[PDB]
Amino acid sequence: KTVVVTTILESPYVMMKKNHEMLEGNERYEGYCVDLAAEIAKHCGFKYKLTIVGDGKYGARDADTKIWNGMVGELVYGKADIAIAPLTITLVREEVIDFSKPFMSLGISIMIKKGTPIESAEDLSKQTEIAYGTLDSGSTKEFFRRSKIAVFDKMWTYMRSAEPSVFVRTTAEGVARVRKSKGKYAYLLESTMNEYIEQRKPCDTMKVGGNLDSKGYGIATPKGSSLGNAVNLAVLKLNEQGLLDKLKNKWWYDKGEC
Amino acid sequence: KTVVVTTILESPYVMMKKNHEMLEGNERYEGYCVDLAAEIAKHCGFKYKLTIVGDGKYGARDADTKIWNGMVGELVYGKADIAIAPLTITLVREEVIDFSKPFMSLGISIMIKKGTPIESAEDLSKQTEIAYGTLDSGSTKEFFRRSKIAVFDKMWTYMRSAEPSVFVRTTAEGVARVRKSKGKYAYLLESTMNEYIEQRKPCDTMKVGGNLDSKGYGIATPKGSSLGNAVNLAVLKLNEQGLLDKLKNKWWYDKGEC
Ligand SMILES: N[C@@H](Cc1conc1O)C(=O)O
Ligand SMILES: N[C@@H](Cc1conc1O)C(=O)O
Ligand SMILES: [Zn+2]
Ligand SMILES: [Zn+2]
């Protein structure tokens, strides 16, 4: 009955506490999703164990093997009971796992090194000098790959053929590339992460333009799991009681450094 | 077999076309939810009949009889098969009906007549010359009635006992009250309607401040319904293809008059 929670090391959702090495179990981690996991568990009445997804991914179906990787795979193949992370609710995922109503709203956004002469996706598409990419698996890449909006189709056409690769394995990798490229690389990531980074030292990046789309993160469970109903209701209750807005402010803005 | 769709006359979601008297059935109406209903039915493969909710309400439970009114009641008591409307996903409603994932995100906002000395809820709570209320039943009124947050708790106390009533029966009545009250009345309504009206003639109102919460509208079905699954998947598909964004620009800003 101890619920195995799969999640991912992604700031400020789940981060290692500075002393984690002298701590045990759930106490080793801190962050928005660590706080949310505690509350979901308390309102649903279950004991849980946080575990970091082994391959460090969000989740995508390999087109050859057709095997799901990341947190989605952990749920699909029975290695975890629930996923509490910045996991995007999408059609292909909803087809294999269950999602609660969203606990956070977001949209794909553009992250630039300050001073970059870019102001929108249209600007990125109309030039070639500043390279741009996305996480190499997950909802953002899939959004561009399936987009039929020309500004986005043009962007995908370029990204899928750019060399060296413009895709990165982790959010941190994308942010570092932005920071170390003197303005020649812009990163396409979720508004939530983009807004977070813009508030952290060295305060050299910023989110530009509006969001490209609109969607949410949901707490996921294995298709038909017994936890789904209570978890969904708990998210709604916690949102209505102001918990979610409080956690957003606590982890994004209250200890912002810029 | 023809699906009975319950919806509500609320601009620009569902409105009577100018020439509706000489039109019939579903053709009499136009709007975002009318376009959405057509997109959902096509993907889920069903024929439908649009019907305006009899009592003109969104849906709330009478504390004494425990009977649901509005579109929620029409689903609860079997008078309709699905509600395609700007119906807000809430915990009390989710307990009695099913909601698809969000097709639109929004938040409670403040509508003022241009030039009114108000910039936030807080601003409304610390004065008494400017009355302010909400729709008479629905998710907004509940929000203030259930607030564990100080500014808002203060707002319910004044609202619940103001006399005469600061509550209104329809969004239109709330908007008209703002407009003819020479700035002595502000109306609390969802950002979607607020932003919409703000872009319509006589262009004398405006949304002030930020949203008070974050939530969404969902397509609702009776508990356990055969349509729940397909509808939910259709919403996600429509969002990802950009149809939902397309419809929003179509009905909100493409014809704006200010
Ligand atoms: N939440 C996303 C991952 C993600 C995080 O930030 N940009 C992204 O693409 C997912 O679920 O793939
Ligand atoms: N969407 C709300 C109603 C509503 C619309 O605009 N302000 C409101 O309160 C509901 O479903 O009750
Ligand atoms: Zn379609
Ligand atoms: Zn009564």
Curated annotation (Swiss-Prot), chains A, B:
Stated family: Belongs to the glutamate-gated ion channel (TC 1.A.10.1) family. GRIA2 subfamily.
UniProt-annotated binding residues for L-glutamate: P86, T88, R93, S139, T140, E190
Residues of the full protein shown: 414 to 794 of 883
Extracellular side: 117-258
Gene: Gria2
Localization terms from the record: Cell membrane; Postsynaptic cell membrane; Postsynaptic density membrane
Disulfide pairings: C203-C258
Note: The postsynaptic actions of L-glutamate are mediated by a variety of receptors that are named according to their selective agonists. This receptor binds AMPA (quisqualate) > L-glutamate > kainate.
Top-level taxonomic group: Eukaryota
Post-translational modifications reported in the UniProt record: Palmitoylated. Depalmitoylated upon L-glutamate stimulation. Ubiquitinated by RNF167, leading to its degradation.
Entry's induction text: Down-regulated in the pyramidal cell layer of CA1 in the hippocampus by global ischemia.
Modification Phosphoserine occurs at: S147, S181
Assembly mode: Homotetramer or heterotetramer of pore-forming glutamate receptor subunits. Tetramers may be formed by the dimerization of dimers. May interact with MPP4. Forms a ternary complex with GRIP1 and CSPG4. Interacts with ATAD1 in an ATP-dependent manner. ATAD1-catalyzed ATP hydrolysis disrupts binding to ATAD1 and to GRIP1 and leads to AMPAR complex disassembly. Interacts with GRIP2. Interacts with GRIP1. Interacts with NSF via its C-terminus. Interacts with CACNG2, PICK1 and GRIP2. Interacts with GRIA1 and SYNDIG1. Part of a complex containing GRIA2, NSF and NAPA and/or NAPB.
Role: Ionotropic glutamate receptor that functions as a ligand-gated cation channel, gated by L-glutamate and glutamatergic agonists such as alpha-amino-3-hydroxy-5-methyl-4-isoxazolepropionic acid (AMPA), quisqualic acid, and kainic acid. L-glutamate acts as an excitatory neurotransmitter at many synapses in the central nervous system and plays an important role in fast excitatory synaptic transmission.
Annotated site (Interaction with the cone snail toxin Con-ikot-ikot): R61, R145, K237
Tissue and organ distribution: Detected in forebrain. Detected in dendrites of neuronal cells. Expressed in the pyramidal cell layers of CA1 and CA3 and in the granule cell layer of the dentate gyrus.
Site keyed Crucial to convey clamshell closure to channel opening: positions: I118
Protein name in UniProt: Glutamate receptor 2
Domain notes: The M4 transmembrane segment mediates tetramerization and is required for cell surface expression.
